[PDB]
Design a binder for these strands. Structure first.
Lengths: 141, 117, 117
RNA sequence: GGAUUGAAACGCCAUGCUCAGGCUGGCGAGUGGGCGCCACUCUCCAA
């Protein structure tokens, strides 16, 4: 769970004909002190055979995933970055195992020094299991 | 439904306490331009652990004026505060949204009682 | 919830000690214009190490005056003071906000008990 | 033990709400105010 915080802001001017007359306005913001998220995804070969999705596109896709946030800086965004990427590659045109089993091989939990609130990626530990023989697991990405 | 003096839900008790403190201040300094409700209401409901230690000082500061007059209205507030705090154990550092809703409910329940005959 | 005589949390004990000290003074000098809490409440909660020693020093005078006449409890008060200060290890130089809140909670819990029965 | 305009009488077989789309861009809690005025540990007791 996350605990949003709400912060108050002020301003030196007004936009329109307001007869206040100095301090002139007040605002608001919402922010998350810290949080960690997880995402899943799939790729289908039969459909690619219809649209023509090719390998170089796959390489470009990996690159985009790795470098997604570098160009997205903004006033409200804060600092965001990616940390891990794991890929499972089946050995034939149709899978060799159910997906939900694969997603279970990845586990995340607090490190030894939990110390209550988490405030950095160092507060968690990540581990990956061993995949079935019919699937290849590569994680260096 | 009305003020339930036996509920013992911590946000509810905090809400009651805030109302009684506001009442005491109003009694102490009539016609104040600014009141604790305007200055602190937003902060207290979100992070009780940060501000209550300050509100309680001014509480005594206000009660001192009254108890120093022939105005005997002035240990009633002290008695109420003793009753309410008697059920608390600690101040939360942070509270969830629904907890804040309960806090507001308790505040409003408490306030109505003070103005009955 | 009520006064817990085995909490052993240092701010809690400090609050209890302050409550008993103020009760002692009240008994010693009725009708005082300015009481110890009107003088020292803020500093006592903020920086215990600064003032508590001299507050303890003055306490002896109040007890000494009381026990000089056929009135007693004073032995009861000094017994509470000794048993409480037995558990305290050392007076902190400074305290955090939540610790200050715990101080007030302990103070009120202790004070309610004294007027029971 | 002939005759209730009666005696008998299925609403039934079966079909994807589908394909996809940024709540965004950004804004000073800031200006400033003496805990002060003043008060005897003092009266007397062989080694």
């Amino acid at each position: 769970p996350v605990v949003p915080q709400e912060v108050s802001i002020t301003r030196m001017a007004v936009t329109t004909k307001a007869e206040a007359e100095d301090n002139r306005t007040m605002g608001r913001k919402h922010i998350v002190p810290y949080g960690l998220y997880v995402a899943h995804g799939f790729i289908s070969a039969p459909l690619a055979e219809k649209t023509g999705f090719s390998d170089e596109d796959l390489t470009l896709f990996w690159d985009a995933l790795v470098n997604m946030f570098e160009h997205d800086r903004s006033a409200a965004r804060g600092l965001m970055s990616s940390r891990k990427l794991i890929v499972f590659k089946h050995q034939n045109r149709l899978g060799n195992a159910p997906a939900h089993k694969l997603f279970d091989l990845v586990k995340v939990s607090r490190a030894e020094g939990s110390s209550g609130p988490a405030r950095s990626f160092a507060d968690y530990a990540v581990t990956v299991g061993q995949a079935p023989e019919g699937v290849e697991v590569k994680e260096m990405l | 439904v009305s003020l339930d003096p036996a509920r013992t839900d911590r946000p509810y008790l905090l809400g009651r306490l805030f109302a009684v403190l506001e009442k005491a201040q109003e009694d102490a300094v009539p016609g104040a331009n600014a009141t604790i409700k305007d200055r602190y209401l937003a902060s207290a409901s979100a992070n009780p652990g940060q501000v209550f230690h300050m509100l309680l000082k001014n509480a005594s500061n206000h009660t001192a004026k009254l108890r120093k007059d022939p105005e005997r209205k002035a240990i009633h507030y002290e008695i109420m505060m003793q009753e309410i705090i008697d059920n608390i154990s600690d101040f939360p550092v942070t509270m969830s949204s629904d907890e804040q809703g309960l806090f507001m409910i308790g505040y409003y329940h408490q306030r109505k009682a003070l103005f009955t005959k």
